[PDB]
Design a protein around this ligand. Structure first.
Ligand SMILES: [Cl-]
Ligand SMILES: [Cl-]
Ligand SMILES: [Cl-]
Ligand code: NA
Length: 129
């Protein structure tokens, strides 16, 4: 599924991401835009052999099991394929674990390099929320 900006914002709000660990909704929408272009089916292979999955490009080295990343953990206890679903519940629940782990949204390289320190409220402007 390729979400619309406001459609994704409202989905993320319904799932409890607005101000989750202090990160306003526009941070999460900005991260999703630059990580996956709002596409739940996005995958990208990393140099170490791991793969990033879904709308928030969650890494198989730590967070999900894809059967082909030796020595990795599965801290969200899910198959990585679950992160590609049109239902973002699995991705949101896993993202809450990631952002709670200490480094906040710096876990998402695109957030650090393209959203941090910007007017992220702009990502939810105009949406009925
Ligand atoms: Cl915001
Ligand atoms: Cl594996
Ligand atoms: Cl933080
Ligand atoms: Na894994």
């Amino acid at each position: 599924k390729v979400f619309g900006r406001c459609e994704l914002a409202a989905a993320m709000k319904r799932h409890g991401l607005d101000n989750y660990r202090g990160y306003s909704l526009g941070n999460w929408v900005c991260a999703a835009k630059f990580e996956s272009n709002f596409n739940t089916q996005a995958t990208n292979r990393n140099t170490d052999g791991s793969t990033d999955y879904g709308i928030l490009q969650i890494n198989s080295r730590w967070w999900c099991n894809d059967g082909r990343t030796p020595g990795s953990r599965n801290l969200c206890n899910i198959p990585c394929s679950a992160l590609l679903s049109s239902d973002i519940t699995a991705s949101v629940n896993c993202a809450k674990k990631i952002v709670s782990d200490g480094n906040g949204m710096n876990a998402w390289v695109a957030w650090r390099n393209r959203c941090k320190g910007t007017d992220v409220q702009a990502w939810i402007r105009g949406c009925r929320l």
